[PDB]
Motif scaffolding. Sequence first.
Motif, short mmCIF file in Angstrom:
data_model
loop_
_atom_site.label_atom_id
_atom_site.label_comp_id
_atom_site.label_asym_id
_atom_site.label_seq_id
_atom_site.Cartn_x
_atom_site.Cartn_y
_atom_site.Cartn_z
N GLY A 13 -8.32 16.85 -11.57
CA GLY A 13 -7.08 17.65 -11.40
C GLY A 13 -6.25 17.22 -10.20
O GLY A 13 -6.61 16.27 -9.51
N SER A 36 -5.86 21.79 -6.30
CA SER A 36 -6.56 22.53 -7.38
C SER A 36 -7.94 23.06 -6.99
O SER A 36 -8.55 23.84 -7.74
CB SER A 36 -6.72 21.68 -8.65
OG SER A 36 -7.40 20.44 -8.40
N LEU A 53 -11.54 20.30 -16.07
CA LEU A 53 -10.16 20.16 -15.61
C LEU A 53 -9.80 21.43 -14.89
O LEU A 53 -9.67 22.48 -15.52
CB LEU A 53 -9.18 19.94 -16.77
CG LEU A 53 -7.70 20.03 -16.30
CD1 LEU A 53 -7.36 18.90 -15.33
CD2 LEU A 53 -6.73 20.00 -17.46
N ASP A 91 -7.13 23.25 -13.77
CA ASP A 91 -5.69 23.35 -14.02
C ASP A 91 -5.04 24.38 -13.15
O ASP A 91 -5.56 25.48 -13.02
CB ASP A 91 -5.43 23.78 -15.47
CG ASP A 91 -3.96 23.81 -15.77
OD1 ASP A 91 -3.30 22.77 -15.50
OD2 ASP A 91 -3.44 24.86 -16.21
N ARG A 102 0.57 17.11 -14.17
CA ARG A 102 -0.03 18.30 -14.76
C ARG A 102 0.07 18.30 -16.31
O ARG A 102 -0.91 18.63 -16.98
CB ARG A 102 0.63 19.58 -14.21
CG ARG A 102 -0.20 20.82 -14.44
CD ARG A 102 0.58 22.12 -14.44
NE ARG A 102 -0.26 23.13 -15.07
CZ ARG A 102 0.15 24.35 -15.44
NH1 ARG A 102 1.38 24.75 -15.19
NH2 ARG A 102 -0.71 25.19 -16.00
N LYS A 103 1.25 17.95 -16.85
CA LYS A 103 1.47 17.86 -18.32
C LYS A 103 0.52 16.86 -18.92
O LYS A 103 -0.15 17.14 -19.91
CB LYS A 103 2.92 17.47 -18.65
CG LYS A 103 3.94 18.58 -18.35
CD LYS A 103 5.41 18.21 -18.58
CE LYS A 103 6.35 19.14 -17.81
N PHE A 137 -2.43 15.80 -17.74
CA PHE A 137 -3.75 16.43 -17.80
C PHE A 137 -3.90 17.37 -18.99
O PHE A 137 -4.92 17.34 -19.63
CB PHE A 137 -4.05 17.25 -16.53
CG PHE A 137 -4.60 16.45 -15.38
CD1 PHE A 137 -5.68 15.60 -15.54
CD2 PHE A 137 -4.06 16.59 -14.12
CE1 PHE A 137 -6.22 14.92 -14.46
CE2 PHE A 137 -4.58 15.87 -13.05
CZ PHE A 137 -5.65 15.04 -13.22
N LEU A 138 -2.93 18.23 -19.24
CA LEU A 138 -3.08 19.23 -20.32
C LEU A 138 -3.08 18.57 -21.69
O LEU A 138 -3.84 18.99 -22.56
CB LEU A 138 -1.96 20.28 -20.25
CG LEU A 138 -2.04 21.16 -19.02
CD1 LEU A 138 -0.75 21.94 -18.81
CD2 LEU A 138 -3.22 22.12 -19.12
N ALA A 185 -6.48 17.05 -22.21
CA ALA A 185 -7.53 18.06 -22.44
C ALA A 185 -7.64 18.40 -23.91
O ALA A 185 -8.75 18.65 -24.39
CB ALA A 185 -7.26 19.34 -21.64
N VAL A 205 -10.74 23.27 -19.90
CA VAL A 205 -9.70 23.67 -18.97
C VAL A 205 -10.17 24.91 -18.19
O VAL A 205 -10.56 25.92 -18.77
CB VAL A 205 -8.40 23.94 -19.72
CG1 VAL A 205 -7.29 24.25 -18.75
CG2 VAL A 205 -8.03 22.71 -20.56
N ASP A 263 -9.09 27.74 -15.39
CA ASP A 263 -7.95 28.34 -14.66
C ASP A 263 -8.27 28.24 -13.18
O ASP A 263 -9.11 28.98 -12.66
CB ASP A 263 -7.69 29.80 -15.05
CG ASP A 263 -6.44 30.41 -14.35
OD1 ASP A 263 -5.66 29.76 -13.62
OD2 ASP A 263 -6.20 31.59 -14.56
#
Lengths: 190, 193
Positions: B7, B11, B128, B130, B156-157, B159-160, B163, B171, B173
């Motif tokens: 991340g 994070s 991850l 996030d 960030r985008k 990474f998502l 995932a 993922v 939080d």
Amino acid sequence: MLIAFEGIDGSGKTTQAKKLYEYLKQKGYFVSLYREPGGTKVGEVLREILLTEELDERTELLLFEASRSKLIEEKIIPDLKRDKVVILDRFVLSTIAYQGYGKGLDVEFIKNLNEFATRGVKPDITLLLDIPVDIALRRLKEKNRFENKEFLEKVRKGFLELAKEEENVVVIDASGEEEEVFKEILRALS
Amino acid sequence: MLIAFEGIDGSGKTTQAKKLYEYLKQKGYFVSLYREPGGTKVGEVLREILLTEELDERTELLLFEASRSKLIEEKIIPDLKRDKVVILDRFVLSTIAYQGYGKGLDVEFIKNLNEFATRGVKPDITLLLDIPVDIALRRLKEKNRFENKEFLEKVRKGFLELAKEEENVVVIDASGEEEEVFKEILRALSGVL
């Protein structure tokens, strides 16, 4: 004008790169001479690491290519743009010969890695200073330097295979005296 | 057992990797914790170079991968063979996100470079952590560290996207308080371990 010198240690490629540099400078070209690995502050730090440390062959390849990438972006591409003649002591062929044919890594992969580090920048001409390994080792012996004949035989074959298959490669008999080798290089550069 | 934490900076992934290391050690696993880049004598030299010097993005990638490669061959592969649990602070996903989605390099190429450095060694699970960029930056602010929101939004985008497309990624939080984030990680790990 990108001129690449390739071959094994003891082939005289360093001496002849330097000879070509002085000669073209005298003829009024603006010239650069860089070595690989090295040629920038960062590449010289990597060079020291490559000579100092014990490294597996993958890590070593990645560091050679990181040096290359720095040199390409920092100096070569701007030199070329200003129409300097760029002379290189070793380039992409030596990486294929040493890390592929020598140490067994995949040749296509090395080629792609080389393409990434160079941004597709290719020599106008590549001078392969070819020499029998026995002779190269006898010349290193004289500077108290020793290298692996078994390893260098493979590296030699690699180079010769690449000369017959890759583009713009002239094979120079590097077994001659300094001045005969240099004349043969001028011949190839005309 | 290879556990990869991935991340952006801020994070908490470093703090949580360390937390997971202590907790599994106490439960009687033999554990290693390494960071990328770094984790070996040579990787730490490269790490210093990556933080010190001004580098174009190709050179930077090749050094990240050279650090990885040293780590994989010097420590991870032998750790894994002795059945140690290996925890990594960053791994292959962070390279794609930062050098690919962040800095524009080609993703398939990064992936192949990754595969080369790792010899095909892949985590059992990738965590991850996030977090919104606004929150990550506010947490760095607190240690007087500042980073580029435009750049991190892309990362960030990245990474998502990774995932939902790559394998064995949970993922987490990472916006929670320290202990809740950790409990969510343990929940994800009870998968294997």
